């Protein structure tokens, strides 16, 4: 039941470990275009929230 | 571990065959080459090569 | 020149590149960082089905 966009659902993420590499097998992932930091180097980041 | 794979599976995780073609184009006696009919060599006279 | 053919899945195709890192990019095929050449990719589920 993904939102509407005109109302988009904000999901904040707690305190946790988290590892960008299971993403790749929940969804086709047509587009992964990432503005900021590199798609390939995430995973050996800490982020504020 | 495997890949089986059925049509019935979506977008993203279907099977992309990938080639890579790694040339070294660099300073040695060149092996492939493009079709090219060479022409004549000239001396002592100025022209592009 | 030398071609390097092989299938992935499709989300790893980005990950044939240069520089990169992730499952494919570390422990089963690596691309220099100072690669020249050209990568072709396809789809595939003609016959892997």
């Known amino acids: ?49 | 571990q495997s890949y089986g794979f059925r049509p019935t599976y979506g977008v993203g995780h279907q099977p992309y065959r990938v080639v890579v073609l790694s040339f070294e184009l660099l300073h040695a006696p060149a092996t492939v080459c493009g079709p090219k009919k060479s022409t004549n060599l000239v001396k002592n006279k100025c022209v592009n090569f | 020149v030398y071609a390097d053919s092989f299938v992935i899945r499709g989300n790893e195709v980005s990950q044939i590149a240069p520089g990169q890192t992730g499952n494919i990019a570390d422990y089963n095929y690596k691309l220099p960082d100072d690669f020249t050449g050209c990568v072709i990719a396809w789809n595939s589920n003609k016959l892997d089905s």
Do not use: E, M, Q
């Open chain 1, 1 to 49: 039941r993904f939102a509407s966009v005109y109302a988009w659902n904000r999901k904040r993420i707690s305190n946790c470990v988290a590892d960008y590499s299971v993403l790749y097998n929940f969804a086709p992932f047509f587009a992964f275009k990432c503005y900021g930091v590199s798609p390939t180097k995430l995973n050996d980041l800490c982020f504020t929230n």
